[PDB]
Amino acid sequence: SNAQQSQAFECTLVTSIETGAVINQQGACDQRVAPASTFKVPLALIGYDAGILLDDKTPAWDWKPGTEARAQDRKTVDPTIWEQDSVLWYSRELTRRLGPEKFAAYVKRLGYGNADVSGEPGKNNGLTHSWLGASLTVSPVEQVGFIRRLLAGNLPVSRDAQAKTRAIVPVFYAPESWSVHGKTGTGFMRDEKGNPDRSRPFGWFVGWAEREGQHIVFARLRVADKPSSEPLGPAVRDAFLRDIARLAVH
Length: 250
Description:
The protein is an alpha+beta fold. Helices cover 35% and strands 24% of the residues. It is an enzyme of class 3 (hydrolase).
């Protein structure tokens, strides 16, 4: 096989909030990958603490000509839609108001992954592409640790910002009355030259879930070595919701 060796892998990490113990772990769950749209969770947190984001419906911004955005994103967006629909330009409008110093200050203070939002050295894309592949990476275990802290309010930002961040995390309902609060992410791994490799798509689903008062925190990440027709983030999500009852039984 003239191609390079396969770097595909899967992780599924579920931990109990009440006992602190791992419930189900498939894969090493320690590999770092760009958070993609999962970064909207700590970015909402940064925005609510800084005061650019106010509540679940404000500020409402309108897409305007000249801004890079998918055809579905060209509408009016507020924090709820931003999270539910993964609106990339709203994230970049939020970082543009934050500025490079405030942005790297919050990411470092949150201890989120490698806390590197400088971007690719030479392209000055820290504020626009760092969470997509340019610099910032995070592992499943670090996704679970951050979400655990967010869920308890122990992150080093205001507790009201954490409450407002939890409120716009999208909600899903899984079998056996599991209420799931999760965020997807989809992207491509980088090739040797630093360009997106479309044969290496990846998908995330990270968040927490509740059933009859018990809480779990989870992270699922799939990194493929072959192209996919559908976005992996939503596919990983749908598979996780179908499985979470058997996954959380231990």
